[PDB]
């Protein structure tokens, strides 16, 4: 998970013409650089550091307009929204309480991004209101099959995550619109 390699993936996807590139990191400085290089969606992870909202705060001040935040903890997600995140990432393995909070805000504002390794799960989340459906099957055959099926279902804002721009480009070709470089 090397930053210089990650930035190069963003650069290559930009050269290929992608306009909805995302970048996942725990460091606002790394995210700011990815932003300058072509990433429009900046995902603050810091699933290790608690007050990772400090990172959201700094990116907000720097002027990024699409900041995402991942936590399984609805209280953390809500704080991140308050500090300027507009995309809250919830996971299939999360407690039901996580979606419950992000759904309240989504009605009122925020977008919900749902990560599952089962495409039928992702479809249900789409039907239940999720704005962004993240495919991250490490098997590429299965992952690209999930992207294809979500496109067939009409699910919108399909995302795929990889450390390799070539896999992201294949996902893009098959129907993914958001391409997450995992730094």
Domain boundaries defined on the chain: 3-182
What is the spatial distance between Cα 61 and Cα 48, in angstroms, rounded to a whole number? 23
Q: Which CATH superfamily is domain 3-182 in?
A: Aldolase class I (3.20.20.70)
DSSP at 23? E
Token pair recorded at residue 82: 């308050």
What is the spatial distance between Cα 176 and Cα 160, in angstroms, rounded to a whole number? 6
What is the spatial distance between Cα 20 and Cα 134, in angstroms, rounded to a whole number? 14
What is the spatial distance between Cα 132 and Cα 115, in angstroms, rounded to a whole number? 9
What is the spatial distance between Cα 58 and Cα 61, in angstroms, rounded to a whole number? 5
What is the spatial distance between Cα 10 and Cα 50, in angstroms, rounded to a whole number? 27
Token pair recorded at residue 154: 């009409």
Token pair recorded at residue 54: 């400090």
Residue 183: closest CA among 71, 8, 23, 54? 23
Which ranges constitute the DSSP H helices of the chain?
A: 3-15, 28-37, 53-62, 74-82, 96-107, 119-127, 140-152, 165-174
CB atoms within 10 A of CB 63: 8
Query: What are φ and ψ of residue 74, in 5° steps?
Result: -60, -30
Query: What are φ and ψ of residue 94, in 5° steps?
Result: -65, 155
Collect all residues with Cβ–Cβ distance below 8 Å to 160 and sequence separation of at least 6: 134, 135, 136, 143, 147, 167, 168, 171, 172, 176, 178, 179, 180
Collect all residues with Cβ–Cβ distance below 8 Å to 168 and sequence separation of at least 6: 9, 13, 18, 160, 162, 176, 179, 180, 181
Residue 145: closest CA among 126, 122, 163, 127? 122
């Amino acid at each position: 998970m090397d930053k210089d390699e990650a930035w190069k993936q963003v650069e290559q996807l930009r050269r290929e013409g992608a306009t909805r590139i995302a970048y996942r990191s725990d460091d606002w400085r790394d995210l700011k650089e990815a932003w300058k290089k072509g990433a429009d969606i900046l995902i603050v992870d810091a699933t290790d550091k608690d007050e990772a909202w400090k990172q959201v705060e700094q990116l907000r001040r720097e002027g990024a307009t699409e900041i995402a935040y991942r936590s399984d903890d609805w209280r953390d997600l809500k704080e991140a929204w308050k500090k300027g995140a507009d995309i809250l990432i919830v996971d299939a393995t999360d407690k039901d309480e996580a979606w419950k909070q992000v759904e309240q805000l989504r009605r009122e504002a925020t977008r919900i991004a749902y990560r599952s390794d089962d495409w039928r799960d992702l479809k249900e989340a789409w039907k239940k209101g999720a704005d962004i459906l993240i495919v991250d099957a490490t098997d590429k055959d299965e992952a690209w099959k999930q992207v294809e099926q979500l496109r067939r279902e009409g699910a919108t804002e399909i995302a795929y995550r990889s450390d390799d721009w070539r896999d992201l480009k294949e996902a893009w070709k098959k129907g993914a619109d958001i391409l997450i470089v995992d730094a």
